[PDB]
Structure 1
Amino acid sequence: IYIIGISVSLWIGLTILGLFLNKAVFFSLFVPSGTPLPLVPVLVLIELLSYTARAISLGLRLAANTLSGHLLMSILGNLVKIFGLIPLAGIFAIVILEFAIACIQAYVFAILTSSYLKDSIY
């Protein structure tokens, strides 16, 4: 699941960079805004560079969520050796937060792709 998540996220990041380059062949008009100086060319950490950082959030969230769920093996040996009822409440809250994190991660990925489609047509 870890190797399949990073490979599927890399294909979605390359499609966002290729779609913006194809639509700029008939309009272009740069991509940045004007100011009183000329140092906007060195700050090219977006568009093409932003696709690799946005796609890495899907793979990093899967590794952090799997590490929290796999920590129950180290806590099970101490509870079967205070009362052990504190581990049931903590595992239920972590499972509810991990399941609800999928809806927040999916909405954040769709919000990032909406800004690239509106900026490419303006």
Structure 2
Amino acid sequence: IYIIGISVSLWIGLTILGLFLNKAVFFSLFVPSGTPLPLVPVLVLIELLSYTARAISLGLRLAANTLSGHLLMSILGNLVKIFGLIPLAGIFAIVILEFAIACIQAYVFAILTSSYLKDSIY
């Protein structure tokens, strides 16, 4: 699941960069705020470079959720050796936060794609 998540996220990042480059062949380009200054081409850490960082951050949700569930093996040996009822409440809160993180990660990926489509048509 970890290797399939990084491979699926890399294909979505290449499609976002290819769609923005195809629209620049008939609607100018620029994409730079000018305010009586220069050195705007050196800070090209967005658009093309931003797709690589957004794909690794969105694809890491599958690996982070598996790390929380795999951490119960270290707490299972100590609870079967204070009362052990504190581990049940902590595992229930981490499972609810991991399931709710999938909806927040899906909304963050759709919000990032809306900025690329709106800037390519302006």
Q: Note whether the superposition's TM-score is higher than 0.5.
A: yes
C-alpha contact 2:13 2:51 (8 A) present in aligned 1: yes
1:10-65 CA deviation, whole Å, 9 max, x = no partner?
A: 00000000000001100123111111211111000000000000001122222222
Structure 2 gap ranges (5+)? none
| Percent of aligned pairs with the same amino acid | 100
Instruction: After TM superposition, give the deviation of residue 67 of structure 1 in Å.
Output: 1.0
1:2 counterpart residue number: 2
C-alpha contact 1:5 1:58 (8 A) present in aligned 2: no
SS at match of 1:38: coil
**Following the alignment from structure 1 to structure 2, what is the Cα–Cα distance between the partners of residues 29 and 111?**
22
TM-score when normalising by structure 2? 0.97
**Following the alignment from structure 2 to structure 1, what is the Cα–Cα distance between the partners of residues 103 and 71?**
23
**Following the alignment from structure 2 to structure 1, what is the Cα–Cα distance between the partners of residues 63 and 109?**
17
Instruction: After TM superposition, give the deviation of residue 69 of structure 1 in Å.
Output: 1.0
Instruction: After TM superposition, give the deviation of residue 120 of structure 1 in Å.
Output: 0.0
**Following the alignment from structure 1 to structure 2, what is the Cα–Cα distance between the partners of residues 35 and 77?**
62
C-alpha contact 1:65 1:98 (8 A) present in aligned 2: yes
The alignment yields a C-alpha RMSD, in angstroms, of 0.8
**Following the alignment from structure 1 to structure 2, what is the Cα–Cα distance between the partners of residues 29 and 8?**
29
C-alpha contact 2:9 2:59 (8 A) present in aligned 1: yes
Moved more, 63-72 or 88-97: 63-72
**Following the alignment from structure 1 to structure 2, what is the Cα–Cα distance between the partners of residues 91 and 32?**
48
TM-score when normalising by structure 1? 0.97
**Following the alignment from structure 1 to structure 2, what is the Cα–Cα distance between the partners of residues 12 and 106?**
13
C-alpha contact 1:17 1:47 (8 A) present in aligned 2: yes
